[PDB]
Design an enzyme around this catalytic site. Structure first.
Site, PDB file in Angstrom:
ATOM      1  N   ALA A  77      34.795  43.058  41.514  1.00 55.54           N
ATOM      2  CA  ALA A  77      36.154  43.190  41.014  1.00 55.54           C
ATOM      3  C   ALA A  77      37.107  43.664  42.100  1.00 55.54           C
ATOM      4  O   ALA A  77      36.862  44.670  42.765  1.00 55.54           O
ATOM      5  CB  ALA A  77      36.185  44.150  39.833  1.00 55.54           C
ATOM      6  N   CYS A  78      38.194  42.936  42.270  1.00 56.14           N
ATOM      7  CA  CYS A  78      39.244  43.316  43.199  1.00 56.14           C
ATOM      8  C   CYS A  78      40.578  42.808  42.664  1.00 56.14           C
ATOM      9  O   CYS A  78      40.624  41.775  41.995  1.00 56.14           O
ATOM     10  CB  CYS A  78      38.969  42.743  44.596  1.00 56.14           C
ATOM     11  SG  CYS A  78      40.097  43.333  45.881  1.00 56.14           S
ATOM     12  N   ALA A  79      41.650  43.544  42.930  1.00 55.08           N
ATOM     13  CA  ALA A  79      42.968  43.177  42.428  1.00 55.08           C
ATOM     14  C   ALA A  79      43.714  42.316  43.441  1.00 55.08           C
ATOM     15  O   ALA A  79      43.835  41.102  43.275  1.00 55.08           O
ATOM     16  CB  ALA A  79      43.773  44.423  42.086  1.00 55.08           C
ATOM     17  N   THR A 117      36.302  39.156  46.090  1.00 52.52           N
ATOM     18  CA  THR A 117      35.573  39.059  44.832  1.00 52.52           C
ATOM     19  C   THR A 117      34.761  37.766  44.748  1.00 52.52           C
ATOM     20  O   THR A 117      33.551  37.794  44.518  1.00 52.52           O
ATOM     21  CB  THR A 117      36.551  39.109  43.642  1.00 52.52           C
ATOM     22  OG1 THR A 117      37.530  40.134  43.860  1.00 52.52           O
ATOM     23  CG2 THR A 117      35.816  39.383  42.340  1.00 52.52           C
TER      24      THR A 117
END
Length: 106
Positions: free
Chosen positions: A10-12, A18
């Site tokens: 998970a990464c924004a 990701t």
């Protein structure tokens, strides 16, 4: 032969991490001959939601994230391997070995 492992990615801002991690990690796990469940969170949008079933299948939970996890509730309390999201990209096989180090270690 096939060790049961689940891993959340998970990464924004920087989803390239990701996806690349989820791909390389998946390739490595398959190459080693195991069964892995890689969860991919596009920040908030979970693209591969691992249910209680899947989470109880995998024994080791690998966390390669820059941001928070939503399904982490079910993974919490299990044996986990926490690393940077960039790690399974360059050292996927090594991360898999690290997971094994949490349950067996060699």
């Amino acid at each position: 032969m096939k060790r049961k492992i689940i891993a959340v990615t998970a990464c924004a801002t920087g989803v390239a991490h990701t996806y690349m991690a989820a791909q390389a990690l998946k390739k490595g796990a398959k190459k080693m001959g195991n069964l892995i469940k890689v969860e991919t969170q596009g920040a908030t949008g979970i693209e591969n939601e691992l249910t209680e079933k899947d989470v109880n299948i995998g024994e080791v939970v690998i966390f390669a994230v820059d941001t928070k996890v939503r399904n982490k509730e079910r993974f919490d309390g299990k044996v986990v391997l926490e690393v940077p999201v960039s790690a399974p990209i360059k050292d996927a096989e090594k991360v898999i070995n690290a997971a094994l180090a949490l349950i067996d270690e060699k």
